[PDB]
Swiss-Prot record, chain B:
It comes from Cereibacter sphaeroides (Rhodobacter sphaeroides). Belongs to the TspO/BZRP family. The chain crosses the membrane at residues 4-24, 43-64, 72-92, 96-118, 123-143. GO terms for molecular function: identical protein binding; lipid binding; tetrapyrrole binding. Keywords: Cell inner membrane, Cell membrane, Lipid-binding, Membrane, Transmembrane, Transmembrane helix, Transport. This is Tryptophan-rich sensory protein. One of its GO terms (biological process) is tetrapyrrole metabolic process. May play a role in the transmembrane transport of tetrapyrroles and similar compounds, and thereby contribute to the regulation of tetrapyrrole biosynthesis. Binds tetrapyrroles and promotes the photooxidative degradation of protoporphyrin IX. Binds protoporphyrin IX, hemin, and coproporphyrin III, but does not bind delta-aminolevulinic acid. Can bind bilirubin, curcumin, gossypol, retinoic acid, cholesterol and the benzodiazepine receptor agonist PK-11195 (in vitro). Plays a role in the response to low oxygen levels and in the regulation of the biosynthesis of photosynthetic pigments. The keyword Nucleotide-binding does not apply.
Length: 157, 156
């Protein structure tokens, strides 16, 4: 088990795809009109939190990818990253709050599945995913409260 | 050699890019764009991508059972993430220039995955060859969309 920079930089580069969805986000008047829960963090907190999580989840996957029998864990990891990339355009771009709740809940399950599978192979890789699952829980709560506290337009049938 | 837990996990992972196509079908903005002479008809794309998601998931299932597959699966996660990213950028945001960068990075990771798969399993690499071909055609379509519609602000 080493700091494998080829593995780490590949996983970090993979986090460039969800990072791009946040980068293409302009100040939205529709988002500032939404009634938010009192524990909603300010907008500037989210890019700082996600950058930390990209490094934590890339370091965790780097450790697991060096271990025998990691196939199922890395399959879960690919799944959570893909649905993570999907969520931001659905919520902010398409303004489809109901589908975004379904997307982030699927992301949550794959984040939980990755964390569990990581714990089976390496305790530190599982520990590194714990703040991710916590943040995914708060993100699911923010999506749920935003829909429950605001007007929602019908989406495409 | 079907590890059904592995294949269904990889197939479910492709539900994220498949969802982007379902929530963002090409509208009249896409039909108004100038197209390259070799532009395929609309029905080709759902047939191509559905086949590729099954092909790439079958390839990853074989590799994930093999000693030393960590780097190959890291490349696989990278190509899938940028695969999921492209449709919202091009069709949702209509940022054609940014979408070209996205699909070119995806192409590199698709090629890197194919190379890494060949190092572990010949059949897994073969299954990725039509993906790299289609990713090449996809990059050309993104490039031709910008070059044939440069008078549109969304192309620059
Ligand atoms: C076999 C070897 C293959 C190795 C390939 C490894 C390929 C290596 C690919 C390298 C990728 C660099 C890491 C990218 C990090 C990344 O994209 O995600 C980060 C950016 C600034 C970072 C760049 C500054 C220079 C998010 O940035 P954010 O602040 O949230 O917006
Ligand atoms: C990484 C690149 C791309 C990805 C991941 C992608 C993804 C998808 C998917 C999954 C579908 C099927 C959706 C469904 O069946 O419900 C689809 C449909 C389609 N896409 Fe793409 N695509 C890409 C590139 C392109 C490009 C470059 C173009 C055109 C320039 C394009 C135009 C279309 C069209 C025309 C359809 C079918 C429309 C219809 O069914 O009526 N796609 N895309
Ligand atoms: C054949 C042997 C293996 C060879 C392997 C070669 C392929 C590696 C390609 C890497 C491209 C790097 C892509 C980096 C993507 C980062 C995305 C980004 O830049 O995001 C920044 C943005 O500011 C935040 O939103
Ligand atoms: C031991 C200390 C370690 C420091 C590590 C580096 C610090 C990086 C920034 C963290 C901010 C996170 C907390 C953000 C909370 C913001 C809540 C808020 O609403 O801010 C209101 C304030 O008035 C705004 O102007
Ligand atoms: C209120 C919240 C504020 C939080 C603010 C604090 C932010 C700390 C971020 C990261 C800590 C560093 C974690 C470093 C983990 C490294 C794991 C690792 O690299 O292990 C692999 C090793 O290289 C193989 O031998
Ligand atoms: C330690 C692992 C590295 C860090 C992992 C990030 C996840 C933790 C959340 C950080 C920002 C919390 C912001 C809290 C905002 C207070 C709520 C409010 O402002 O009201
Ligand atoms: C507002 C929401 C704040 C976050 C909700 C609290 C965190 C719930 C999940 C904990 C996972 C812990 C995993 C333990 C692994 C052993
Ligand atoms: C489906 C998977 C579980 C969904 C993830 C669990 C969602 C928890 C939501 C949450 O704890 O948010 C705090 C709540 O909004 C405070 O009012
Ligand atoms: C083209 C898009 C198609 C989208 C639909 C694709 C099919 C999804 C099927 C089932 C959900 C996947 C569930 C994840 C796999 C569960 C099996 C598993 O993870 O096994 C656990 C392992 O054995 C413990 O060690
Ligand atoms: C276009 C249609 C898009 C379809 C959308 C995608 C479909 C996702 C379906 C099920 C996700 C299930 C989440 C994975 C939960 C796995 C839990 C599990 O199997 O636990 C195993 C154990 O934790 C490991 O050791
Ligand atoms: C390979 C043969 C493909 C036949 C299916 C086909 O051409 O579809 C036509 C399209 O659906 C008409 O709108
Ligand atoms: C526009 C640029 C087009 C570039 C087009 C090339 C892109 C991919 C590069 C090399 C593929 C070679 C991959 C296979 C490398 C050797 C594999 C091997 O060693 O064996 C394979 C098989 O298992 C038994 O021969």
């Amino acid at each position: 088990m080493n700091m494998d920079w080829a593995l780490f930089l590949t996983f970090l580069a993979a986090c460039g795809a969800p990072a791009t969805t946040g980068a293409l986000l302009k100040p939205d008047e529709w988002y500032d009109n939404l009634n938010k829960p009192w524990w909603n963090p300010p907008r500037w907190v989210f890019p700082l939190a996600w950058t930390s999580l990209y490094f934590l989840m890339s370091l965790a996957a780097m450790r697991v990818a060096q271990l025998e029998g990691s196939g199922q864990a890395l399959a879960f990891y690919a799944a959570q990253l893909a649905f993570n990339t999907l969520w931001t355009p659905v919520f902010f771009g398409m303004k489809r709050m109901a589908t975004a709740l379904a997307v982030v809940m699927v992301m949550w399950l794959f984040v939980a599945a990755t964390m569990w599978a990581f714990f089976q192979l390496d305790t530190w890789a599982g520990v590194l995913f714990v703040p991710y699952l916590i943040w995914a829980t708060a993100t699911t709560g923010l999506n749920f409260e935003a829909m429950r506290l605001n007007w929602n337009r019908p989406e495409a049938r």
